[PDB]
């Protein structure tokens, strides 16, 4: 019995927490990511990189804490602990945002480990690896948003910060600087996520309300055996209901469940493509026809032109505090603003 | 056998290709009226003075809008919450200038969707089904009612209702963030949990069923042909799905009961959308998201900014530029 | 006013939801299919195809 | 050298439901991207 | 509006090419 086979035996044991070969890269990496985030949100400041308090220790709450992105001055430096910036000094590494690349890179390798775990368990149990394929959506989003967007930008500084309000800032920043709501790729992503929610709610409700009377109690949950060969709900009744309500209905359950994977996953992929565009400032920012017309015709207004104005206001009022390293001095008189307000 | 009885039997007939029902006798005229007026307005309606300051906004395709920028513009702020049917205008052109199509379309739409919910119950009753699909449908109904009816009522004007268009929707959201900090409202956070989780669970359930399909086909054909409409037998092995998922996380984090699983799948996004609908409905009365501006002070009393402060700067930027000509006084009270 | 209005709108909405829940359940239970579809006498199996 | 019949040819199929789904997809994709093509 | 003069050919082809692909495939199904 060779040592490799013995190791593969121990790693693939049936225990409370399956480990597998993937676990050697999923567990330490996920634990570094999670512990780094908890550590940073509890103890670490963004004072020297952003001019912001970002931990519980400084008084922020769950909504306002973050592992903030590193200072712009480092560009895309990987900010290794032993790297030329921190030079092995743990305190300096904390103060320069070194926890952001730590959480991002351990999280990326942890996500790789989780997908490898999906594949490994699928193979052991003997099923198709569609759960692993479904998870490619989340990885596409993580890679495009947390790695490729800042990689195309000036530095890790403009990557989203790992925090509730940090994420909200990133969202509003993409609105005001990139007009990200106007981006068709985001629109396809919105359609995918909303359609995924819709499909979840409508399948759940349909199944629960077409259940076969398989028991005597009002508690219909007890009327299902995991090993039973029979369908627990009427697909014919469901099909007729939706055909007469909505005009169309699923008639193939396999296609229904594939569609439930396809929609949100495809939406995440499409939004990721759009974000990759935004990494290079390739934005669907404007409709040039309407800009040319409004330039020439001062009576012409649409909701699009109004949103353009909103974005200009956001940019001018947010830039000095959001990008403190640029030393944006915008005197009050140059700040765009409507009447009175 | 009477003629009224014959009509009742036809209306409540389960053999009609599209079920009508009593709720349908209201749904069909209202939704048809709303669709006709919406398509005609979206294509051809003249500009609308939304902000009541005589600054008409072009919403229709023929006036220079594309599909993304086109909208049916909400009725004038001068109207406020006043009822504005066609017969209250001195001409159709005055009706159009003041955004009457918006009122017609929204009122008929709202009635139509409440009737759609009732119709879902009605057909379930006629089919001998359990009755709660309409309860799940009440979540999007609540959200639509929030943006088209409750928010205008609370703010005091149908001009504050969501525009019937894509860029109009973004304008609504941006203005809403600027005046209510919806991102920092916990009910919106539950709505985001509802939609992110609804997509997560849709992907999870779809992928687990698709992964655990019983072999029925050859490799040259779509696996979907392994299911036959109306078949007695289950098309995938829930036991295999549970073994995989309970090893992916831990045995007790996985469902072995399809009924319990399909309940969870229905309940999670539905509850999340109920919360977000109620969030929009309560910010209609200006009970806004969390305010943490200048919450952190140092010992001397100087403000240490947080991410909430930067978000507030973005909100102020949005707020000072919105409806740039509509405010005469310092505070945006509605 | 904000507290009272927001609170009672939310309670009114969730009580509309409760009305729908219990009204649909009361109807189904009176009719005898609140516990699910009987397999032998599933109504759709005796109804003609829509097309 | 002769031209022999290949045995690896398989029929291709697109059912009517797939036709409708694909046509709706193409239609809505056009609806989405037309405004950006015109710019 | 000063639109992209290539927008109309692009939109027409963007829709018509996959449309004809789909129609060809559907009409020949069953041969």
């Amino acid at each position: 019995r060779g040592w490799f086979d013995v190791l593969d035996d121990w790693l693939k044991r049936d225990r409370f927490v399956f480990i597998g070969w993937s676990g050697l890269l999923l567990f330490p990496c996920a634990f570094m990511a999670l512990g780094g985030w908890l550590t940073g949100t509890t103890f670490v400041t963004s004072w020297y990189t952003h001019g912001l308090a970002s931990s519980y220790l400084e008084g922020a709450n769950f909504l306002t804490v973050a592992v903030s992105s590193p200072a712009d001055a480092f560009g895309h430096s990987l900010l290794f602990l032993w790297g030329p910036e921190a030079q092995g000094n743990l305190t300096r590494w904390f103060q320069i945002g070194g926890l952001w690349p730590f959480v991002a890179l351990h999280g990326a390798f942890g996500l790789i480990g989780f997908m490898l775990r999906q594949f490994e368990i699928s193979r052991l149990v003997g099923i198709r690896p569609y759960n692993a394929i479904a998870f490619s959506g989340p990885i596409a989003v993580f890679v495009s948003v947390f790695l490729m967007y800042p990689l195309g930008q000036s530095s890790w500084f403009f990557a989203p910060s790992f925090g509730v309000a940090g994420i909200f800032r990133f969202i509003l920043f993409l609105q005001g600087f990139h007009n990200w709501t106007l981006n068709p790729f985001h629109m396809m992503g919105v359609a995918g996520i909303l359609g995924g929610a819709l499909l979840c709610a409508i399948h759940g409700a349909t199944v629960e309300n077409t259940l076969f009377e398989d028991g005597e109690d009002s508690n219909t949950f007890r009327a299902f055996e995991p090993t039973q060969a029979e369908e627990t709900y009427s697909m014919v009744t469901a099909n007729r209901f939706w055909s007469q309500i909505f005009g169309i209905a699923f008639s193939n359950k396999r296609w229904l469940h594939f569609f439930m994977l396809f929609v949100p996953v495809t939406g995440l992929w499409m939004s990721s493509v759009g974000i990759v565009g935004l990494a290079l400032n390739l934005r669907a920012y404007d409709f040039v026809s309407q800009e040319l017309r409004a330039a020439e015709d001062p009576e012409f207004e649409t909701f699009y032109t109004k949103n353009i104005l909103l974005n200009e206001g956001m940019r001018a009022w947010m830039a000095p505090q959001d990008q403190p390293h640029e030393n944006f001095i915008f005197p009050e008189e140059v700040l765009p603003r409507g009447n009175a307000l | 056998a009477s003629l009224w009885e014959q009509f009742c039997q036809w209306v409540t007939s389960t053999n009609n290709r599209i079920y009508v029902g009593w709720f349908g006798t209201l749904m069909i005229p209202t939704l048809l009226t709303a669709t006709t007026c919406f398509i005609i307005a979206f294509i051809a309606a003249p500009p609308v003075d939304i902000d009541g300051i005589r600054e008409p906004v072009a919403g229709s395709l023929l006036y220079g809008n594309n599909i993304i920028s086109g909208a049916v513009v909400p009725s004038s702020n001068a109207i406020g919450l006043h009822f504005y049917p066609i017969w209250e205008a001195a001409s159709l052109d005055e009706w159009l200038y003041n955004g009457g199509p918006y009122q017609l379309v929204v009122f008929h739409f709202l009635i139509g969707i409440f009737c759609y919910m009732g119709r879902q119950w009605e057909l379930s009753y006629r089919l001998g089904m359990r009755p709660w699909i309409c309860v799940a449908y009440s979540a999007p109904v609540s959200a639509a009612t929030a943006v088209f009816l409750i928010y205008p009522i609370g703010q005091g004007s149908f001009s504050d209702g969501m525009p019937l268009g894509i860029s109009g929707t973004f304008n609504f959201m941006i203005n809403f963030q600027a005046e209510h900090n919806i991102l920092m409202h916990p009910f919106h956070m539950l709505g985001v949990a509802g939609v992110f989780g609804g997509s997560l669970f849709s992907a999870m359930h779809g992928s687990l069923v698709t992964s655990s399909l019983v072999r029925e086909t050859t490799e040259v054909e779509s696996q979907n042909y392994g299911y036959k409409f109306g078949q007695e037998e289950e098309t995938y092995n829930i036991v295999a799905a549970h073994g995989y998922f309970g090893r992916l996380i831990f045995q007790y984090a996985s469902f072995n009961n399809s009924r319990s699983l399909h309940f969870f799948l229905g309940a999670w996004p539905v509850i999340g959308i109920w919360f977000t609908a109620m969030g929009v409905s309560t910010m209609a009365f200006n009970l806004n998201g969390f305010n943490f501006n200048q919450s952190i002070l140092d010992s001397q009393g100087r403000v240490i900014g947080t991410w909430a402060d930067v978000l507030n700067r973005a909100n102020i930027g949005f707020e000072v530029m919105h409806e740039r000509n509509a405010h005469n006084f310092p505070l945006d009270l509605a | 006013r904000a507290w009272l209005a927001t609170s009672h709108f939310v309670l009114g909405f969730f009580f509309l939801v409760g009305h729908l829940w219990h009204a649909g359940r009361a109807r189904a239970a009176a009719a005898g299919f609140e516990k699910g579809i009987d397999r032998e006498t599933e109504p759709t199996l005796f109804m003609p195809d829509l097309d | 050298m002769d031209r022999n019949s290949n045995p690896n040819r398989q029929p291709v199929e697109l059912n009517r439901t797939s036709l409708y789904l694909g046509l709706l997809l193409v239609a809505v994709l056009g609806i989405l991207f037309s405004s950006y093509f015109f710019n | 509006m000063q639109v992209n003069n290539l927008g109309f050919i692009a939109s027409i082809l963007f829709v018509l090419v996959p449309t004809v692909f789909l129609l060809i495939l559907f009409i020949q199904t069953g041969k």
Binding site: - | - | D51 | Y20, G30, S34 | -
Partner: peptide
Amino acid sequence: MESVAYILVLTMALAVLFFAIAFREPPRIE
């Protein structure tokens, strides 16, 4: 004339809806 393009793609979508409902593959119990 971009208006013609927009109306045409919207009309294609709506007509597809009509045909998909009125002329769908009839679900049959086999």
